Design a protein around this ligand. Structure first.
Ligand SMILES: [Mg+2]
Ligand code: NA
Ligand code: NA
Lengths: 214, 212
């Protein structure tokens, strides 16, 4: 339902079966590509309409200041800091621009992360306490240990006691950004033939890397 | 450079002393720093270490580390002291061994000497654009964007990089080298590749971006 690594394509997706292979391999081959096939036709049309409207120079890309104008699921408004992390899930060579398919995926990633926060606010307090962060990330497919969980709150909560939607979205941006970093590292053919993605093993990477931000 | 340190005559250990070092010391990336410490420097570090190790545990904790008088007047903030500990302490023990300290100290002196070498106008500061070549000389093959971020991350708003900023930078780079070992010694990735500075630099660039 929420696992980033095995999102089922939906009925009534905006793409027909052959369209998948019309996508450039650049998009096709990415870890986040399955997000695209969970977007229904009407959400696609809406996202497309928006992007064309902000894309005043007709470049086919957004940069961070256009991204921050976005009207995101749950009324999420992006901080500069979080918008940068979000761009960097997709912009892995610091162009400072994302494509339309990358934006589509970012938007659907935000919706999934929103929905997940709401699902986990079982007591309807409107926030997550820091000890609630770990099982929620686990549902998304990020397997971390308790120390990494509590450091994530520290790092991204801007001093607040609990984890509001803004802090959750920053944590999820960082976690996905880190997933793209892992790809970029291990894409390097110096490491030899690439091992398949394993969430348990990735989690150890996320633990070690999160420590470095302290 | 950091990965290819020349042995010095008058090292504090003789040739047989090297094979009696503990395996958890011998098989680290930083081991070769130890054989660059002259005899008189050893007895100095030894004497100091024994002095601050108040309960005679044979270990050093962060508060005692921060009492150190380091090369060139370096003073470690709590945050830089933590990074320094983490080069060595990679499983959150909260302390380091005598030998781990010796290595940290010599690492500091190496960074200091390199700072001096690159401070061409003896201003006691490096300009942002001067950071990259000095890091390359140390063995950290990073790109310009990475160098400028490291400055901005660690400079406390200053436009320049003083020695204390330089050591914070160096601590982070070294900390990341230990992290690299941590990640890659996981049997899932297979036998670790021989260390390569050019490939490690790419890692350091990617990881540094995550801090922004
Ligand atoms: Mg003690
Ligand atoms: Na709650
Ligand atoms: Na200077």
């Amino acid at each position: 339902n929420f696992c980033l690594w095995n999102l089922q394509p939906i009925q009534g997706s905006w793409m027909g079966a052959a369209c998948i292979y019309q996508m450039p391999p650049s998009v096709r081959n990415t870890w986040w590509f399955p997000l695209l096939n969970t977007i229904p036709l009407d959400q696609y049309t809406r996202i497309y309409q928006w992007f064309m409207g902000v894309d005043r120079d007709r470049s086919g890309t957004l940069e961070i200041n256009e991204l921050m104008m976005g009207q995101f699921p749950g009324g999420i408004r992006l901080s500069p800091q979080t918008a940068l992390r979000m761009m960097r899930i997709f912009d892995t060579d610091f162009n400072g621009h994302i494509s339309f398919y990358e934006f589509m995926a970012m938007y659907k990633f935000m919706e999934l992360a929103y929905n997940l926060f709401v699902m986990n606010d079982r007591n309807r307090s409107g926030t997550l306490e820091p000890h609630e962060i770990l099982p929620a990330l686990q549902q998304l497919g990020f397997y971390i240990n308790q120390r990494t969980s509590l450091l994530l709150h520290r790092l991204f909560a801007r001093g607040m006691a609990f984890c509001d939607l803004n802090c959750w979205i920053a944590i999820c941006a960082f976690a996905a950004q880190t997933r793209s970093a892992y790809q970029m590292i291990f894409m390097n053919p110096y490491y030899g033939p690439m091992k398949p993605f394993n969430p348990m093993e990735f989690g150890k990477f996320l633990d070690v890397v999160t420590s470095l931000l302290e």
